[PDB]
Design a protein around this ligand. Sequence first.
Ligand SMILES: Nc1ncnc2c1ncn2[C@@H]1O[C@H](COP(=O)(O)OP(=O)(O)OP(=O)(O)O)[C@@H](O)[C@H]1O
Ligand SMILES: Nc1ncnc2c1ncn2[C@@H]1O[C@H](COP(=O)(O)OP(=O)(O)OP(=O)(O)O)[C@@H](O)[C@H]1O
Lengths: 549, 551
Amino acid sequence: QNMMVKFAGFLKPLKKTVLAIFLASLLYTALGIAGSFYIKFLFDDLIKFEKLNDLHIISAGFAVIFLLQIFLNYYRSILVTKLGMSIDKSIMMEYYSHVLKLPMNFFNSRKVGEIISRFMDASKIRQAISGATLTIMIDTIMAVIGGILLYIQNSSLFFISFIIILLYGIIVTVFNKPIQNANRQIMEDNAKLTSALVESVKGIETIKSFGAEEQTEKSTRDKIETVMKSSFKEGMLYINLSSLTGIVAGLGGIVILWAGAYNVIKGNMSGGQLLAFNALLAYFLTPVKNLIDLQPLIQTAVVASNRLGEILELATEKELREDSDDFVISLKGDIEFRNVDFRYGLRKPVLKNINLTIPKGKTVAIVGESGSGKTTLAKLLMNFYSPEKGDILINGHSIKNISLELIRKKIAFVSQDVFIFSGTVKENLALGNENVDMDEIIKAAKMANAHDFIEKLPLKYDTFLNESGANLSEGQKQRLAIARALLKKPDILILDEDVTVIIIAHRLSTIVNLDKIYLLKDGEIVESGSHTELIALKGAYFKMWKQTE
Amino acid sequence: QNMMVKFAGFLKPLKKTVLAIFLASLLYTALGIAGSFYIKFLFDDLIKFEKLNDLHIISAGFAVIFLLQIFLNYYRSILVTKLGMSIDKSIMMEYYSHVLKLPMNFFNSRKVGEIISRFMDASKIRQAISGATLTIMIDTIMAVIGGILLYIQNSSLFFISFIIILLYGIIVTVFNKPIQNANRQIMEDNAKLTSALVESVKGIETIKSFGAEEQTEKSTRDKIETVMKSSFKEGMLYINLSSLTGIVAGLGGIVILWAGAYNVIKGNMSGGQLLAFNALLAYFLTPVKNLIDLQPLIQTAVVASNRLGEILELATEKELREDSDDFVISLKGDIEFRNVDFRYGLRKPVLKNINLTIPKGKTVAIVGESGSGKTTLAKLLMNFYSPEKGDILINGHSIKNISLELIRKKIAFVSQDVFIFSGTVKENLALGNENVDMDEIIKAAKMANAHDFIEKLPLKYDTFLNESGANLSEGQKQRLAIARALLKKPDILILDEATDVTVIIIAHRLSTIVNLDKIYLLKDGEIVESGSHTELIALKGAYFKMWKQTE
Ligand SMILES: Nc1ncnc2c1ncn2[C@@H]1O[C@H](COP(=O)(O)OP(=O)(O)OP(=O)(O)O)[C@@H](O)[C@H]1O
Ligand SMILES: Nc1ncnc2c1ncn2[C@@H]1O[C@H](COP(=O)(O)OP(=O)(O)OP(=O)(O)O)[C@@H](O)[C@H]1O
């Protein structure tokens, strides 16, 4: 429905191409019809009258007609391939561009394969256009014209043919829903297999280290077996459809001939009148059979399009929050949490009522226990997820009224899962903005003390890095990631071990001498202040310090 | 290449099914030939004789023979489907089970999209099996028989028909190689695109954080445009091939009719001979053209079967060493790194001549600046990469002699990265051996101080964890990994930053290992300074300066 409107909008710029395809199709059909008159004239005129030069002229003419037919087919086929390629590219690009903008909980709740599997299933829309456009354009008009011609030719035999077509229609609508169910099932099974296979290949180090190759092999064999069962149950459905349609066609033809012979035996028609009708049936039954044979392709394309559209209907990140203010550009200092409450989906609320303030341009630290909301605060400050019953204010302006691009550009976050893409270091070290000069990159790298190891690399800053940065070590990857973050020139820098920096450290030894320290326990700030104040108050910080040290 | 042998080996257990397919298809063709006489028998011999009961009997008979035709088609098709699934499943399973055994040099070189793209391009072989087998088996025999019938019928035009076959042969030979080139190019471009897609997702955190949703879009658009260019070249090549074949076929039919007409005009064979020849021509040219129409499809099946081949020929991990299990089943300490130099693929030598000993028990620690190669030593003890020159002795016997399975089952190594498989906490905790009682898992989780958060989770040890363990935090993931390693009951335990059994601790901060037994300092891939904490600090060496810098 909506997706069909989308395809209509995609086809609208290609009206000239579609019209050219249609005109070439009409010329090809007309030449194909005129082709058989070669034999028809040859064995009625040329042979009986013993003409030689006339025979040569006629043979050359029919060869010329056939050559024009082939050229028209060639031109039409090129145009149809162009149309299919354009539509497929547009679908893939739109889907991918929308996926990259989805909210984060979508990515956290969906397997990798099931996000790209649908992408790879956009080829079935391309495989449906190329294999059905010509048929839909020519055989519809061919069938209508054939119906008119049979109606003016005979009455009773035309009604028998109409019963054949009605039976065709009854067959098609019965096998409509089950084919969709089979297609959806096989698509879901392929998605699950792809997801599990990607997940197994990526983390091969753990499998090899624990020697769990047998378990992974058995699980993938189970998933392949499920794929086979679904594909078998779909293939039986297709073969049932094909056999039943074939029986209808063959028995319809035989009954047509039987009725014609019976009528010829009595006085109803003449043998020539039956032969002409039988010859003319080749322009009516065959087109409808050709339209109905397309059913698997169009059904698969419709299911694939619905599966793609199940994602496109989702709301992107920017579509969730409204308004942009745009008056604020200088996000700096005085970060405020105002009665913030957060809860990941339906789990217990990990982040209860908290009210914490951060002074302008000061180095503050967060200390808690494993399971508290430290990284949750870090991700919440950069608006990956929105809170429930609170506001986050920066310099008196709410986080909800600041454009996403400003937040992403102006706040840097250095997590523990460093990701390094495939490509040269210059690309990895400059990901956000593809405009910086080498002086800034070198300054940022020297600031993070990443200049040594990057010098030691073969092609200085132009060395190639394998996927997931396996070409480097863990420390080198962490240093390169912190250099990339520092290159951003941020105003709010979060580190997860006049620019405000928040350090999230699990070791209390490095927390000392960091201005203000926030003790986050049970999803609430139990205590806050400088290190000396927490030591003097003999709070939970004192016990934590005594236990760790 | 040599994949045909393995294909034949797969086919060998299915000889009965293949024979049944052949017999059913042959009966289908014979019934089709017999039933194609209905119109001629009706018009020529039935209606002109005014027979009505005979009409009814013959029409019923031809309906019956058609229904038999449909039953044979149903049986043949279901057998072909079963054959296709069987071979396809066998091929994919063999490929995957081989990939899981390749050495780590293969995984750090390729991408995580090339391997999966090669796996998923094995459905082309199933498409070929489902599409071409029937046409081949019937139409080869049909073409041979049609040729014999044409030769016995008239020898004047059979030579023109042979000329047509020769033109098909030349066209196929000319278009053989460019089709393979185009197929290989499109498969390689799809592999690149799929790898880019997989890398962009699971990594979306960094893209969103750095605001790179447009640059990634641009790169993926360029890759899709390259795929479309290769696809267009392949499509144009296919259309050129099909147009040449169509021209040859149509012009050959017209030329045969022209030659027959010219023959009939002169004092030669009568028109009835020409009609018989034209009727027989549908039994020779139409089948042989059907084989030629299988040229593209079959080629796309061959190239895929070649791609899988160049993964299977790679030497596995178990095949690059000799087994000397004998009686050693215990890695009980006394580790010795004799003179060993290890280089990675081609970069530089990162480990120079190394000589060290680790006692039977005790807790030992290795320190050194980034790039020294501590993780390299840890990976060497697991035999992920074999040393270029030298040997590593576990207890009097080198690792090369000890079986791989025993090494992987007795040494635990917790790394900086933690991988959590999608599933349940119980399944992730029990990854090595599937059959573990609940008591052992609970004890291991308690030892790693990870039972508390598991218990606080909903459904205790069920807590279905999403991909990459996104359901849990990072500290919980580290605790889970340590618990999983401890469940292994290891003889050697290697501990990274993630925090009578020999313990090797790779420590980044010098203050966490001051009370250990021995400390090894890696400088320029060497252990120039070694000993306990007291000796190094008193020596006023590089360790002393490192300690002062830390303090
Ligand atoms: N896959 C690889 N291919 C090539 N060189 C590599 C590869 N992995 C690491 N190296 C390099 O070889 C050395 C191995 O370092 P290793 O991984 O042992 O880290 P490290 O010295 O413990 O440092 P850190 O713990 O700070 O990451 C480093 O110089 C690193 O740059
Ligand atoms: N994607 C998620 N879905 C559901 N719950 C989650 C998700 N990510 C984290 N949690 C839960 O949210 C809580 C807070 O986790 P968080 O990352 O803030 O902890 P932390 O204190 O930073 O961790 P660490 O132990 O690594 O220092 C934990 O109970 C964790 O299990």
